Scaffold this active site. Structure first.
Site, short mmCIF file in Angstrom:
data_model
loop_
_atom_site.label_atom_id
_atom_site.label_comp_id
_atom_site.label_asym_id
_atom_site.label_seq_id
_atom_site.Cartn_x
_atom_site.Cartn_y
_atom_site.Cartn_z
N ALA A 184 0.81 -1.21 0.00
CA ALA A 184 0.00 0.00 0.00
C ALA A 184 0.85 1.26 0.00
N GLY A 200 3.16 5.47 2.85
CA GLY A 200 4.32 5.48 3.72
C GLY A 200 4.03 5.24 5.19
N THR A 201 4.95 5.70 6.04
CA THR A 201 4.82 5.54 7.48
C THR A 201 3.55 6.20 8.00
N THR A 225 12.87 7.87 1.00
CA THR A 225 12.80 6.58 1.67
C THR A 225 12.37 6.59 3.13
N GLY A 250 10.87 6.28 26.48
CA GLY A 250 11.03 7.44 25.62
C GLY A 250 9.84 8.36 25.78
N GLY A 272 5.86 8.27 22.09
CA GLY A 272 5.67 7.66 23.39
C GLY A 272 4.49 8.23 24.15
N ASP A 277 11.84 12.47 5.93
CA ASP A 277 12.53 11.92 7.09
C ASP A 277 13.95 11.45 6.82
N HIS A 285 -16.01 35.66 18.15
CA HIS A 285 -16.24 35.56 19.58
C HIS A 285 -17.54 34.77 19.76
C1 LIG Z 1 3.22 6.28 15.25
C2 LIG Z 1 3.60 7.50 14.44
C3 LIG Z 1 2.77 8.61 14.45
C4 LIG Z 1 3.09 9.78 13.69
N1 LIG Z 1 2.21 10.84 13.75
C5 LIG Z 1 2.50 11.95 13.02
C6 LIG Z 1 1.60 13.10 13.03
O1 LIG Z 1 0.57 13.12 13.66
N2 LIG Z 1 1.96 14.19 12.26
C7 LIG Z 1 3.17 14.20 11.48
O2 LIG Z 1 3.39 15.19 10.84
N3 LIG Z 1 3.99 13.17 11.47
C8 LIG Z 1 3.72 12.04 12.20
N4 LIG Z 1 4.58 10.99 12.16
C9 LIG Z 1 5.81 11.06 11.33
C10 LIG Z 1 5.44 10.92 9.84
O3 LIG Z 1 4.83 9.63 9.69
C11 LIG Z 1 6.70 11.02 9.00
O4 LIG Z 1 7.30 12.29 9.20
C12 LIG Z 1 6.36 10.90 7.52
O5 LIG Z 1 5.72 9.63 7.23
C13 LIG Z 1 7.65 11.04 6.74
O6 LIG Z 1 7.32 10.93 5.20
P1 LIG Z 1 8.40 10.42 4.25
O7 LIG Z 1 7.70 10.54 2.87
O8 LIG Z 1 9.60 11.11 4.38
O9 LIG Z 1 8.72 9.02 4.61
P2 LIG Z 1 7.90 7.69 4.96
O10 LIG Z 1 6.46 7.99 5.13
O11 LIG Z 1 8.54 6.90 5.86
O12 LIG Z 1 7.83 6.89 3.67
C14 LIG Z 1 9.01 6.29 3.04
C15 LIG Z 1 8.48 5.16 2.13
O13 LIG Z 1 9.63 4.68 1.37
C16 LIG Z 1 9.49 3.22 1.26
N5 LIG Z 1 10.86 2.83 0.94
C17 LIG Z 1 11.99 2.97 1.72
N6 LIG Z 1 13.10 2.51 1.13
C18 LIG Z 1 12.68 2.05 -0.09
C19 LIG Z 1 13.40 1.43 -1.22
N7 LIG Z 1 14.70 1.20 -1.24
N8 LIG Z 1 12.61 1.10 -2.30
C20 LIG Z 1 11.26 1.32 -2.33
N9 LIG Z 1 10.52 1.88 -1.35
C21 LIG Z 1 11.27 2.23 -0.25
C22 LIG Z 1 8.93 2.83 2.59
O14 LIG Z 1 8.38 1.54 2.52
C23 LIG Z 1 7.88 3.92 2.83
O15 LIG Z 1 6.57 3.61 2.46
C24 LIG Z 1 4.30 9.78 12.90
C25 LIG Z 1 5.15 8.66 12.88
C26 LIG Z 1 4.82 7.51 13.63
C27 LIG Z 1 5.76 6.32 13.55
C1 LIG Z 2 -28.97 33.91 21.90
C2 LIG Z 2 -27.92 34.76 21.23
C3 LIG Z 2 -26.72 34.18 20.83
C4 LIG Z 2 -25.70 34.95 20.20
N1 LIG Z 2 -24.54 34.29 19.85
C5 LIG Z 2 -23.55 35.01 19.26
C6 LIG Z 2 -22.30 34.36 18.89
O1 LIG Z 2 -22.07 33.19 19.08
N2 LIG Z 2 -21.33 35.16 18.29
C7 LIG Z 2 -21.56 36.55 18.04
O2 LIG Z 2 -20.66 37.16 17.53
N3 LIG Z 2 -22.70 37.15 18.37
C8 LIG Z 2 -23.71 36.44 18.97
N4 LIG Z 2 -24.86 37.07 19.32
C9 LIG Z 2 -25.02 38.52 19.04
C10 LIG Z 2 -24.18 39.33 20.05
O3 LIG Z 2 -24.69 39.01 21.35
C11 LIG Z 2 -24.34 40.81 19.74
O4 LIG Z 2 -23.85 41.06 18.43
C12 LIG Z 2 -23.51 41.63 20.72
O5 LIG Z 2 -23.94 41.41 22.09
C13 LIG Z 2 -23.68 43.09 20.34
O6 LIG Z 2 -22.82 43.97 21.33
P1 LIG Z 2 -23.26 45.39 21.60
O7 LIG Z 2 -22.15 45.91 22.53
O8 LIG Z 2 -23.46 46.13 20.44
O9 LIG Z 2 -24.60 45.34 22.26
P2 LIG Z 2 -25.26 44.54 23.48
O10 LIG Z 2 -24.38 43.44 23.93
O11 LIG Z 2 -26.60 44.32 23.32
O12 LIG Z 2 -25.13 45.45 24.70
C14 LIG Z 2 -25.87 46.72 24.84
C15 LIG Z 2 -25.92 47.00 26.36
O13 LIG Z 2 -26.47 48.35 26.51
C16 LIG Z 2 -27.33 48.32 27.69
N5 LIG Z 2 -28.15 49.51 27.45
C17 LIG Z 2 -29.02 49.73 26.40
N6 LIG Z 2 -29.60 50.93 26.45
C18 LIG Z 2 -29.08 51.52 27.58
C19 LIG Z 2 -29.31 52.85 28.18
N7 LIG Z 2 -30.12 53.76 27.69
N8 LIG Z 2 -28.59 53.08 29.35
C20 LIG Z 2 -27.74 52.16 29.89
N9 LIG Z 2 -27.47 50.94 29.39
C21 LIG Z 2 -28.17 50.66 28.24
C22 LIG Z 2 -27.98 46.98 27.61
O14 LIG Z 2 -28.54 46.64 28.85
C23 LIG Z 2 -26.81 46.08 27.21
O15 LIG Z 2 -26.16 45.42 28.25
C24 LIG Z 2 -25.94 36.35 19.97
C25 LIG Z 2 -27.14 36.96 20.36
C26 LIG Z 2 -28.15 36.19 21.00
C27 LIG Z 2 -29.43 36.89 21.42
#
Ligand SMILES: Cc1cc2nc3c(=O)[nH]c(=O)nc-3n(C[C@H](O)[C@H](O)[C@H](O)COP(=O)(O)OP(=O)(O)OC[C@H]3O[C@@H](n4cnc5c(N)ncnc54)[C@H](O)[C@@H]3O)c2cc1C
Ligand SMILES: Cc1cc2nc3c(=O)[nH]c(=O)nc-3n(C[C@H](O)[C@H](O)[C@H](O)COP(=O)(O)OP(=O)(O)OC[C@H]3O[C@@H](n4cnc5c(N)ncnc54)[C@H](O)[C@@H]3O)c2cc1C
Ligand SMILES: NC(=O)c1ccc[n+]([C@@H]2O[C@H](COP(=O)([O-])OP(=O)(O)OC[C@H]3O[C@@H](n4cnc5c(N)ncnc54)[C@H](O)[C@@H]3O)[C@@H](O)[C@H]2O)c1
Ligand SMILES: NC(=O)c1ccc[n+]([C@@H]2O[C@H](COP(=O)([O-])OP(=O)(O)OC[C@H]3O[C@@H](n4cnc5c(N)ncnc54)[C@H](O)[C@@H]3O)[C@@H](O)[C@H]2O)c1
Lengths: 452, 37, 452
Positions: free
Chosen positions: C35, C38-39, C137, C174, C179, C302, C434
């Site tokens: 397949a 690679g690794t 490789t 390790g 690890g 690698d 936010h």
């Molecule tokens: C358990 C584990 C988890 C990992 N998790 C991550 C991760 O989350 N994120 C990340 O970025 N990296 C991760 N890595 C590292 C990542 O897998 C390697 O950096 C990456 O595979 C390197 O790519 P490569 O193309 O250089 O080599 P490799 O993927 O090793 O591939 C080399 C290939 O060459 C073939 N080969 C070798 N010699 C020959 C030859 N003479 N003729 C023909 N074919 C040959 C081998 O069979 C192989 O398939 C992890 C590694 C391990 C072991």
């Molecule tokens: C259920 C729900 C979920 C939401 N989820 C999101 C989200 O995930 N992401 C997002 O970006 N937006 C979200 N919003 C919208 C977000 O809440 C508004 O865009 C944001 O609160 C607007 O800020 P603001 O400062 O303009 O007004 P507001 O936060 O409404 O604040 C105005 C303030 O002025 C006070 N006030 C008003 N008139 C007077 C006065 N005359 N004297 C003194 N105080 C006064 C009020 O009491 C209030 O506290 C959501 C809204 C609702 C209803």
């Protein structure tokens, strides 16, 4: 008076405050809620992500783990909710810590403009002044008149994050990110979930191919997703509620989540006193420097135009304060990622194919499937793909999209590439660890670059 | 053209991009290239 | 004859072959194993990652899942191994598919040089010629004379990936990546694991702070890790083996894994017939273009100097063939990530602090803990950190290191940053979703940049 007064302590306001402090400004922050962190930390990103991460592990254990046999899996909802609450508490406490560490003053109450330079904190009666004022009041759930939310049976995302018991049947009105994420959370816990979407596709901010793929994936998991369905009414009744659809069909459920969108929030702000107003969608208009029509008053986050995302709000907060102090600031909207935290995750960064087509921008498509990924196979994942869109002439990356396990994490790299104005070649030639999911992105990039 | 931090450094020192020679990947000016001039 | 003859079908050879074909060369590949792959594919990266991913899920289920109760988790070793085998099978078939698709000819047998331009396939008797020859490789397990490996009781990594039953006690000689990874695999399944390491630290290629943190984490998980221990002998016994340590202490176990390293493999290659030879470490010397002393013969992977990683081999293969065809070619060794796939993951990219200190390079350090991450908290993770090393004058990123859940995926972004010669500011300023683990990298970068 303060150098900067920030209204709202969400991702936009609290990050802006910290950056401002790092730049030497003396900052004051007004927040009406007891805890800091805004929507995201209190009832958004954080609690939702806590539930998504934990329910996913429970769900997988129930479905079965490769190489093992799980005898039984019993849900402990209180413990699940306890984890969520503890995470939220740690986060909100973190922001408090950062404010004290950075010398940022906090005021509790509703801020209201008295003039363009003076703000009243109603609850206390304090009248604060500042050289610059930053409006970061965020958003609130959109609740149409036809949706009779009682915050118990018919709820918004906030209550859906805390159901006292898994609902036997949950109907989600709106197939957007909130609807799908929370629908998935409860489906994983045993609820029959039905998602009703008005449009012909779900997840409107994703690339269309991705939205369609997501719809198929979620249906396979067991969620019922009906598109092209306009809900006309939702009314609480007895232990649950009834949902009426255009045409007359009526559905019954134990809980109904109304997630048809979020709207800019400016209630009680009295913008008119500062000479400011909101547009048709309730947004506060701002210019290229995030300044309102009144030069020293800025607006950022969910209250202004653009994707309603936490990091988008934070990035605008930084740009706003840097402009105040240095005279220049910038947000690279094209490099901002959008992620859906379901499993698989769904993500987008940059332009979708629909946006490129609408602009008449010539582009190449590079796509690589998770099925061809050694790391994905090792994980037991095979569904999903990542697509890279690159300019047909300059090879510049225009957008990256995907669906699959941890695709959001993978696309963090895509966002960086876009931030650096990288080409598909640049991304594709960069070293990537083997075997990793990042190689899917690398291969998608190479395919895009090597497209005819 | 250049890296985001380079543009930030140039905008502060009022340095023109057509003045710094990019040594980054391809045609990109690194922030170290700006402080070099 | 062929334009290019590749010896070895691992990550280096098979990727080189494919790239050569894309460039228009007529390629032939010689591989002695049935397949291809690679690794890495046959007995490395792939099977090990299949085992690591699956055992981690089983382990977490046994430890307990947030928000749920599991009455029991029963291991099904045959099924676990079946998955591993199925993944390897799919990967190897994939390479065969790519060779056929790219018109790459395959020869089965051991390649041996007859001269500088002619190679003999021992088994078949074919004598192949080519304009260019690429030696890929790979490597083989290092087995010192004192380690009496019998491939049953005392084994190498290959057999440790296929134990017929979970060992009662597995001694690992390790404390390197192999690890630790394989020790962790079996520890998760119930084996008492003892890792014996000669040096004062484990994981020799990681940053020292990271190696120390890893040692602490693994000990906490339950593995016994003894450093400063020189194993003097490993000898098979009745139904196990004994491990002798310098000093006289003797340990016994039913299985012993010898993972004290891997060495370049060139057996049966007859390098001398091509006018080539190996150095003291068994490596084939190569110049800056990966050419050996004989101009038209190249060596990669690698079998030559550098980190023994799959992607390192693949990148060198690409650079070698591109030099053959275009006269260019380059490998950015500083952007090559090294990852340990345990949980938490452990990773390194670029220079370690030890390497910077030795070269007298002034640098700044930015560190951010997983405990400060909202996403990590949401996941139920708190251990770990990411460290960014940046030049004290230019702020250029010199290296990134970390330990934590999916830190390898997070560092894919760090590798891209290094590839683009990015500064800490560049990375820290980039948009990050936010709430995501990528924010930990972002904050680490900002800290390095802002480091006083
Ligand atoms: C358990 C584990 C988890 C990992 N998790 C991550 C991760 O989350 N994120 C990340 O970025 N990296 C991760 N890595 C590292 C990542 O897998 C390697 O950096 C990456 O595979 C390197 O790519 P490569 O193309 O250089 O080599 P490799 O993927 O090793 O591939 C080399 C290939 O060459 C073939 N080969 C070798 N010699 C020959 C030859 N003479 N003729 C023909 N074919 C040959 C081998 O069979 C192989 O398939 C992890 C590694 C391990 C072991
Ligand atoms: C259920 C729900 C979920 C939401 N989820 C999101 C989200 O995930 N992401 C997002 O970006 N937006 C979200 N919003 C919208 C977000 O809440 C508004 O865009 C944001 O609160 C607007 O800020 P603001 O400062 O303009 O007004 P507001 O936060 O409404 O604040 C105005 C303030 O002025 C006070 N006030 C008003 N008139 C007077 C006065 N005359 N004297 C003194 N105080 C006064 C009020 O009491 C209030 O506290 C959501 C809204 C609702 C209803
Ligand atoms: N993780 C994230 O990035 C994230 C998470 C949650 C929310 N958000 C943001 O918050 C904002 C709001 O989230 P949202 O999902 O609640 O709104 P949304 O815009 O993301 O989805 C709303 C959906 O409701 C549908 N809809 C509207 N009226 C309907 C009706 N009568 N019947 C059936 N369907 C109907 C719409 O067609 C739309 O697809 C968005 O801007 C979103 O980007 C982001
Ligand atoms: N995920 C990955 O990237 C990955 C995975 C596996 C292997 N690899 C690579 O493959 C190669 C070999 O891996 P390896 O772990 O088998 O070798 P290694 O070099 O990584 O670790 C070998 C260890 O054995 C120790 N040792 C040597 N003699 C000893 C003795 N007598 N007693 C006790 N300890 C002793 C050494 O001090 C060393 O720490 C490396 O280059 C590695 O980088 C990479």
């Amino acid at each position: 008076m303060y150098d900067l007064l920030v209204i709202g302590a969400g991702p936009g306001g609290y990050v802006a405050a910290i950056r401002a402090a790092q730049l030497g400004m003396k900052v004051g922050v007004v927040e009406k809620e007891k805890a800091l962190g805004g929507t995201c930390l209190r009832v958004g990103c954080i609690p939702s992500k806590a539930l998504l991460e934990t329910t996913e592990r429970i769900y997988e254990a129930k479905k079965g783990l490769l190489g093992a046999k799980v005898k039984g899996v019993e849900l402990d909802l209180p413990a699940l909710m306890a984890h969520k609450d503890k995470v939220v508490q740690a986060n909100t406490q973190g922001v408090e810590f950062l404010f004290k560490k950075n010398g940022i003053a906090r005021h509790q109450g509703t801020a209201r403009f008295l003039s363009e330079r003076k703000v009243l904190v109603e609850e206390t009666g304090e009248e604060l002044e500042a050289r610059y004022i930053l409006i970061a009041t965020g958003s609130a759930p959109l609740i149409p008149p036809w949706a009779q939310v009682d915050y118990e049976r018919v709820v918004t995302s906030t209550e859906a994050l805390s159901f006292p018991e898994v609902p036997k049947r949950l109907i989600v009105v709106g197939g957007g990110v909130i609807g799908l994420e929370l629908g998935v959370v409860w489906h994983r816990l045993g609820a029959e979930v039905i998602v009703l979407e008005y449009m012909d596709r779900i997840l409107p901010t994703m690339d269309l191919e991705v939205s369609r793929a997501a719809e198929r994936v979620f249906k396979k998991q067991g969620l019922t997703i009906r598109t092209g369905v306009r809900v006309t009414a939702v009314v609480p009744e007895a232990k649950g509620a009834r949902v009426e659809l255009e045409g007359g069909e009526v559905l019954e459920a134990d809980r109904v989540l109304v997630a048809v969108g979020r709207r800019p929030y400016t209630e009680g702000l009295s913008l008119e006193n500062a000479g400011l107003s909101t547009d048709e969608r309730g947004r506060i208009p701002v210019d290229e420097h995030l300044r309102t029509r009144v030069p020293h008053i800025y607006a950022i986050g969910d209250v202004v135009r653009g994707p309603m995302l936490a990091h988008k709000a934070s990035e605008e907060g930084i740009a706003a304060v840097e402009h105040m102090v240095r005279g220049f600031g910038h947000v690279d909207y094209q490099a901002i990622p959008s992620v859906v935290y379901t499993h698989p995750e769904i993500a987008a960064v940059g332009y979708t194919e629909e946006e490129l087509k609408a602009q008449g921008i010539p582009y190449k498509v590079g796509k690589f499937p998770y099925s061809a990924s050694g790391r994905a196979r090792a994980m037991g994942e095979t569904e999903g793909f990542i697509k890279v869109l690159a300019h047909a002439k300059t090879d510049r990356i225009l957008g990256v999209h995907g669906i699959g396990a941890r695709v959001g994490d993978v696309l963090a790299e895509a966002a960086l590439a876009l931030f650096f104005k990288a080409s598909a070649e640049d991304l594709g030639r960069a070293p990537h660890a083997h075997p990793s999911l990042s190689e899917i992105l690398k291969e998608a990039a190479l395919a895009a670059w090597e497209r005819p | 053209l250049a890296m985001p931090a380079a543009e930030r450094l140039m905008q502060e020192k009022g340095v023109s991009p057509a003045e710094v020679q990019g040594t980054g990947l391809g045609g990109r000016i690194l922030k170290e290239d700006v402080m070099r001039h």
